[PDB]
Amino acid sequence: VAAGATLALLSFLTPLAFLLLPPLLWREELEPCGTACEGLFISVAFKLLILLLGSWALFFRRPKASLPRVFVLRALLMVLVFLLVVSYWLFYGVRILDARERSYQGVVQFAVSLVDALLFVHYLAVVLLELRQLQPQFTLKVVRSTDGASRFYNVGHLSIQRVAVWILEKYYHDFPVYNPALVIAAAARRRDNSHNEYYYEEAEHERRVRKRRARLVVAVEEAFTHIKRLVMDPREAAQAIFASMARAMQKYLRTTKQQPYHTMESILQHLEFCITHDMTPKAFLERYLAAGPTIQYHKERWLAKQWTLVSEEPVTNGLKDGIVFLLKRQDFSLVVSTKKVPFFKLSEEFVDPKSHKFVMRL
Amino acid sequence: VAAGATLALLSFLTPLAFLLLPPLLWREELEPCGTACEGLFISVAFKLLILLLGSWALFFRRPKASLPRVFVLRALLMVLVFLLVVSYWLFYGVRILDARERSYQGVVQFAVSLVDALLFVHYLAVVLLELRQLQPQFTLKVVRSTDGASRFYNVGHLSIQRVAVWILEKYYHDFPVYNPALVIAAAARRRDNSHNEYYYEEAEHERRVRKRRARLVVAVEEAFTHIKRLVMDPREAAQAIFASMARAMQKYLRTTKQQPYHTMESILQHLEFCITHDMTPKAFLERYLAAGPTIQYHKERWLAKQWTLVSEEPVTNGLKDGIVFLLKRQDFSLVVSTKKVPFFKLSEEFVDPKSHKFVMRL
Amino acid sequence: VAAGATLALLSFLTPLAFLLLPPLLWREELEPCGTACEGLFISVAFKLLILLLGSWALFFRRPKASLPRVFVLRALLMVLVFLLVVSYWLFYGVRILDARERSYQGVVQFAVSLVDALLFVHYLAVVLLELRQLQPQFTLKVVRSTDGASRFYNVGHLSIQRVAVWILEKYYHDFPVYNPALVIAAAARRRDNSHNEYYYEEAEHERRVRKRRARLVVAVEEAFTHIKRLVMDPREAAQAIFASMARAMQKYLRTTKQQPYHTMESILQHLEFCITHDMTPKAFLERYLAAGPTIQYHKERWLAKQWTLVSEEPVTNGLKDGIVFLLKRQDFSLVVSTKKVPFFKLSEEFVDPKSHKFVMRL
DSSP states (O other), rough: OOHHHHHHHHHHHHHHHHHHHHHHHHHSSSSOOOOHHHHHHHHHHHHHHHHHHHHHHHHSSSOEEEOSSSHHHHHHHHHHHOOOOOOOHHHHHIITTTTOOOOOOHHHHHHHHHHHHHHHHHHHHHHHIIITTSOOOOEEEEEEEETEEEEEEOSSSSSSHHHHHHHHHHHHHHHBBOOTTTOHHHHHHHHHHOOOHHHHHHHHEEEEHHHHHHHHHHHHHHHHOOOEEEEOOOHHHHHHHTTTTTTHHHHHHHTTTOTTTOOOOHHHHHHHHHTTTTTHHHHHHHHHHHHOGGGSSSTTTTTTTGGGEESSSTTTSSTTTTHHHHEOOOOOOOEEEEOOOOOOOEEOOOOGGGGGOOOOOO | HHHHHHHHHHHHHHHHHHHHHHHSSEEESSOOOOHHHHHHHHHHHHHHHHHHHHHHHSSSSSEEOOOSSSOOHHHHHHOOOOOOOOHHHHIIIIITTTTOOOOOOHHHHHHHHHHHHHHHHHHHHHHHIIIITSSOOOEEEEEEETTTOOOEEOOSOOOOHHHHHHHHHHHHSSSSSOTTTHHHHHHHHHHHHHHHHHHHHHHHHHHHHHHHHHHHHHHHHHHTTEHHHHOOOOHHHHHHHHHHHHHHHHHHEEEEEEEETOHHHHHHHHHHHHHHHOOOOHHHHHHSSSOGGGGSSSTTOGGGGGGGESSSSOOTBOOOOOEEEEEEEOOEEEEEEEOOOOOOOEEEOOOGGGGGOESSSO | OOOHHHHHHHHHHHHHHHHHHHHSSSSSOOOOHHHHHHHHHHHHHHHHHHHHHHHHHHHSSSEEESSSSHHHHHHHHHHHHHHHHHHHHHIIIIIIIIITTOOOHHHHHHHHHHHHHHHHHHHHHHHIIITTTTTTOEEEEEETTOOOOOOEEOOOBHHHHHHHHHHHHHHHHHHHHOOOOHHHHHHHHHTTOOOHHHHHHHHHHHHHHHHHHHHHHHHHHHHHOEEEEEOOOOHHHHHTTTTTHHHHHHHHHHHHOOOTTTOHHHHHHHHEEEEEEEEOOOHHHHHHSSOOOOSSSOOOTTGGGGGGESSSTTTTTTTOOOOOOEEEEESSEEEEEEEOOOOOOEEOOHHHOGGGGGOOOO
């Protein structure tokens, strides 16, 4: 990442060097030129300000991911910046600096062309890195291998590793959080005719979850009726009203297998959060009634540095119809299937709004 | 917004002024120049057409929101357009217009550099206003403070007010519509051991909602069997078949607290809409069975001009990990929590499709 | 589509022709020029490489749809490329080629202006085709006319046919798959007071779906316990463990009307898929328990070449508040209603985090 900052600093200082070396080295040898040179100095100044603000807006940011192989398009852009700036330096050396060029208008036009080329490389960087994948080309079915939480997405032309990082960004807010606490045909006919134990255990579990949920709703309502706006801190008020709801919260988190997701300190911080921002009991309970996504919880449960990209294809290739890859973790795996978004043939049919006529029969 | 139109008109007329003032003021004093000048006139004409079509496509539109503070990047762009065009006017005045420049090739190259700079400012405007927030940087948990309807979003680098307008654009089609019609530990142990009244009231409410829903489904099916395609207007046919379903619709909207959402005229317009476009009874009922989002209903219920941005941070700053802000309204409040999308470290693992081998034991 | 490739090849070869015809036709007549010409040759080479890589990244791809009328903005871009390149050819012919221009610096600057104009046309193409619709302007309610599956979307400034293709791209992964197997007021009062047959048939159907689902879950769990990692192919292992679950799968697909969606070969391929990628029984069953979207199934069920755009407005116009159009198919119709995203007026309200004070009463 240091080579990118080196290329950025060199590319920013190279037009200023190309403009400031002939007045510093051969000033009296240099030919005087008219107002066209100074107008091109103004163009260099404003276009370098545009280049600096654009590179600030899109490229002066930390890397959001560590890819297992090389970023192909970003390495292409770095090689393009390197070869462009090195070729401009080589030409400026062997045909302007060593030759002691007198026509300063040509040197300033050369710097103008350099800044135009750097702005066009910045535009190509936006095209390659951000604009290429806007048009949706593929539909991704992403399924957890453990509980079968499935979402579908539309993705554009990206490589498999960039699609993988994209899916991991969707995963932490789209799927529910992972919870690990949640002859032959004749034997199958004999077993399927037996007592349907799982049906009644499921009905018992749904019934007792609804009962513990009702106890929790009544507990948190009667808890939030113990305070009112106004001396007592929201931490102290949350600690006061937690005692009238800790037992029903503990019972509901035991019956829904959500015990290690919510410590007592996290529930106290979320109580302080809810009574600070004037949230009702139901807006408090929405964090606890359902499972909720992975980013809702503590950072020790994210484990975002422990993902593994398992693909039979080399992961720098783009997607195609039939690509399946795994986003493995120590706990589960995200199975990703790729299908091509199909070709559409729309036809146009005109109807008349007058032509909608009706009868009373059938 | 008038200053933006003034800057746009001035920036469009400034290259034409820079090209047309030397033939109008000093024509016989002006030096003749070759075909390079006329080729640059062609470049000025086509690049100004490109600039006009791009500014039409992205910037000749009404403001979608009224922000509580200044749009920082748009004011930066307006200051950049102003300082660029004013500096080109000052140089053209004090070094071309007052000096009566004879080298017309330099003046036309100066206008070419001006149009290139305006196209680069337009590109910087697209980078700052639209391309900066494409890369998702933050996950937003947006929760209504009243009923706890929660959605998560990925947002890029935006200020808090632009994130707020973005969330309000997501709110009108993502959340359901707001419906306002919907010692201590020993006392909590005594209360949680009492009769679970809320559980049975919830079961009674779900049962009677399912019964009124079944009555409504049978009513709307038998209502739509009273007409057929073909003389009778769809308004007249909707008014005819509404009488066989108005009672069950009124009972279902009473039992689900959806009475002021649906007037009789709105249900008649939606009946005319459904029988016009050949919609089934279930496609009619999907508007009424669930609550549905806020933009599905009448404009007096949107109240989009009554939002309030409550943030402890000054709202022109970008988001960071831990920003919480409220989108208050007179009825409720959207509590928005910001978390950073975590850094990913993908590793690559190669598996062999031949290496998937299986046994029959366990 | 051949005219677009012809314009692309002509636009790529035109600057090289403008640079290479004066050394090939009048070489000794041609005036020698300094290092400014060669620096502009370097600028032409790198900017043509930028133009080639950008046109590869965004425009060297197959059309994703067949629109019923002309793509208005793409035809505008093709007319702009055609008129620009034809005007540069006409000027180069009648003022450089026929006149036998000696000032070669003007010819090379003319080619530089041509490549700058082509890069600006490419930028305008990105603005018109991709950047115009990023800012969400409209909310689309898309409802199937048969079962009332409804989704809402935010769309930007697009024409009705491009919005239609956009909705069809959202449709194949957002909606569930279409399943066709799923005086007057006094008579309505008499019928609504009768036996609520549909309520009890619905409760019976939900109960038997839960029972067949429980049988299927137990069957697929006991089926996946018949194999283990390690000689036997995943096709052979899937065929072995399918016999202990085919009866409960067939019963669940009969009771949920999902019989023609899943052939025996498709279930065997998905079993091989799940045991290959170490998916649990629940991750196998997520494809079968719910309906799921249309792209999840076989390509004979997509029928993406059979959509019909029914609009009272001519479909090359952009959306506005109140546009309703149909995306008809032989089976159903997607009714699309357009509403304008409302204007927001945010106000700012500062609260003090110290000012959150609380009491114990009420």
